[PDB]
Amino acid sequence: DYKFWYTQPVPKINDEFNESVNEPFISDNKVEDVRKDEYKLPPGYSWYVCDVKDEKDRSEIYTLLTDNYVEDDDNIFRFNYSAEFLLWALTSPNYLKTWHIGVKYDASNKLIGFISAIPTDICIHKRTIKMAEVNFLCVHKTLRSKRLAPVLIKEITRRINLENIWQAIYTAGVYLPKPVSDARYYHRSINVKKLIEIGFSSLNSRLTMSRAIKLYRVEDTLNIKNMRLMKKKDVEGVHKLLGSYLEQFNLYAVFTKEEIAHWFLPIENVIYTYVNEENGKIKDMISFYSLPSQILGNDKYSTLNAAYSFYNVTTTATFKQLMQDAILLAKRNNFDVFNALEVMQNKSVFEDLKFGEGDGSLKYYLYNWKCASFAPAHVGIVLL
Ligand SMILES: CCCCCCCCCCCCCC(=O)CSCCNC(=O)CCNC(=O)[C@H](O)C(C)(C)COP(=O)(O)OP(=O)(O)OC[C@H]1O[C@@H](n2cnc3c(N)ncnc32)[C@H](O)[C@@H]1OP(=O)(O)O
Ligand SMILES: CCCCc1c(C)nc2ccc(OC)cc2c1SCCC#N
Ligand SMILES: [Cl-]
Ligand SMILES: [Mg+2]
């Protein structure tokens, strides 16, 4: 029925727009009209402004998400974003502490809800719009289906609107009104044996355990010999390389130099970026972020370490060679699996590089924006 979503400036289930439509559902919005009062919570609960740069407030967010965030359909896994990753993801340039919103249960003083946004310039079908990118919406498992999520959504919407921002981008594995694109995930096994032991990958009489380990074996030698961790000096070159590349897509972020530095400069166990520098210019880049999952009730293993493909550009190699080196660099860093979405040029490399098609997909959404939907090959942005 989408009783909450149908109240919002988003497309209906049946809405389809021509390619030339590219505009807000509701235009001419005024900051002066925005409600100044916080949305009402049920009795016994209060808004809390989280300070993500405070280790202890950050750890409270970490706990909530560790225990209560997204699980796969089969409840094998729960994502387990680290505390340091949350710091990185939430404190990009011009972030607002007031857009990192908690809800506490008063009697326990415990965080039971969260939602966040950061500001980003988003180009959709050639129009660049100031938007908020929303993530980490989470209600405690003991408090589900009580309509707390719309309260979280309406309150962050209000706080964003106070900044004269009227559009947002967000992604979800669930279907909501109405995706602008949909991309499946694909997985490249690295630690084949672990993936078999936890019930994720499957063997048969043609594919015995030794055969499966050999199938996924990689040569520890880069196609691009000088690929190396990005350093502060590389910022201008990555900004040039990436920013030019992204302009071919129908949906992408428009990064400033400050944004390049924050999003790509490497941080151990969070973000890995490698570059190939020739005569002081950056000609190729690989990047992936770390996102482990908790393995739910497995006797032997508690964590699956996973790298997620981020942005990758090649000018001196084939896209296949570049991604083969991204898998190698992920293996060198102790990742169990390398995950990517069929966005940008990715789908082309998946069969040859031994990726398997996953079980679900990630839907991309705009809030208060009307445009034609598009195939994921035309998506040029990867959210966290
Ligand atoms: C201009 C600024 C604009 C800013 C804001 C833009 C929009 C930002 C939107 C947020 C983007 C976040 C992106 C993001 O974080 C990445 S997607 C991951 C979201 N988090 C999880 O899945 C965590 C595990 N689950 C939970 O914590 C709860 O199940 C949540 C909190 C998901 C729902 O709590 P609950 O206790 O299960 O449910 P009620 O409180 O009873 O509420 C049910 C209503 O919630 C709608 N719902 C369910 N899942 C949703 C989802 N993933 N997006 C949006 N809406 C979602 C649902 O369709 C229904 O409305 P409907 O009746 O119309 O069908
Ligand atoms: C082994 C392939 C990775 C799949 C995976 C893992 C490890 N954890 C998840 C936790 C939550 C969840 O919510 C839908 C999905 C997963 C998945 S599949 C989607 C992410 C990817 N790739
Ligand atoms: Cl309301
Ligand atoms: Mg609820």
96 is an annotated ligand-binding site residue: no
5 is in an annotated binding site: yes
Output the CA 115–ligand 1 centroid distance in Å: 10
Give CA–CA dist 329/327, Å, rounded: 6
- Sequence-separated (6 or more) residues with CB below 8 Å from residue 255: 239, 242, 243, 246, 263
What are the backbone angles phi and psi of residue 149, rounded to the nearest 5°? -65, -45
**Resolved by:** X-ray
Task: Compute the distance between CA of residue 283 and CA of residue 277 in angstroms, rounded to an integer.
Answer: 6
Residue 314: phi, psi to the nearest 5? -125, 135
54, 15 contact by CB (below 8 A):
no
Beta bridge partners of 49: 101
- 147 has binding-site annotation: yes
Q: Is the CB of 10 under 6 A from ligand 1?
A: no
C-alpha 127/C-alpha 123 separation (Å) is 5
Per-residue CA distances from 38 to 154, 170, 347 (Å): 9, 22, 44
Q: For the beta carbon of residue 262, count every other beta carbon within 10 angstroms.
A: 18
What's the gap in Å between 358 CA and the centre of ligand 2?
8
Q: Is the bond preceding 3 in cis, omega lying within 30 degrees of 0?
A: no
Resolution in angstrom units: 1.5
Q: Is 356 in the pocket of ligand 2 (CB under 6 A)?
A: no
Ligand 1 pocket test: pick from 137, 164, 171 the residue with the most ligand atoms within 8 Å of its Cβ: 137
Ligand 2 touching residue 71 (CB < 6 A): yes
Phi, psi for residue 350 in degrees, rounded to 5: -70, -40
Is 274 touching ligand 1 by the criterion CB < 6 Å?
Answer: no
Structural domains in the chain (count): 1
- Residue 357's CATH number: 3.40.630.170
CB neighbour list of residue 68: distance below 8 Å, 6 or more residues apart:
138, 139, 140, 141
168 Cβ inside 6 Å of ligand 1 = yes
145 vs 121: CA distance, rounded Å: 33
The alpha-carbon radius of gyration of the chain (Å, integer) is 21
* Angle at CA of residue 88, ends 86 and 90, nearest 5°: 65
CB of 121 closer than 8 Å to CB of 129: yes
Separation of alpha carbons 66 and 84, rounded Å: 13
| Ligand 1 center to 311 CA (angstroms) | 27
Q: Treating both helix axes as pointing N-terminal to C-terminal, what angle do 235-246 and 257-264 enclose, rounded to 10 degrees? A: 100
Treating both helix axes as pointing N-terminal to C-terminal, what angle do 83-90 and 55-68 enclose, rounded to 10 degrees? 110
Are 168 and 64 within 8 A, CB to CB?
no
Burial string for 274-294 (b: 16+ CB within 10 Å, else e) reads bbbbeeeebbbbbbbbbbbbb
Answer yes or no: is the C-beta of 99 below 6 A from any ligand 1 atom. Answer: no
Range of the domain at 11: 1-384
Q: Are 312 and 326 in contact (CB under 8 A)?
A: yes
Ligand 1 neighbourhood includes 157 CB (under 6 angstroms)? yes
- SS (HEC) of the chain: CCCCHHHCCCCCCCCCCCCCCEECCCCCCCHHHCCCCCCCCCCCEEEEECCCCCHHHHHHHHHHHHHHCCECCCCCEEECCCHHHHHHHHCCCCCCHHHEEEEEECCCCEEEEEEEEEEEEEEECCEEEEEEEEEEEEECHHHCCCCHHHHHHHHHHHHHHCCCCCCEEEEECCCCCCCCEEEEEEEEECCHHHHHHCCCCCCCCCCCHHHHHHHHCCCCCCCCCCCEECCHHHHHHHHHHHHHHHCCCCEEECCCHHHHHHHHCCECCCEEEEEEEECCEEEEEEEEEECCEEECCCCCCCEECEEEECCCEECCCCHHHHHHHHHHHHHHCCCCEEEEECCCCCHHHHCCCCCEEEEEEEEEEEECCEECCCCHHHEECCCC
Residue nearest to atom 3 of ligand 1 (CA): 157
User: In one letter, which amino acid is 288?
Assistant: F
With b meaning 16 or more CB within 10 Å and e meaning fewer, what string describes 306-326? Answer: bbbbbbbbbeebeeebbbbbb
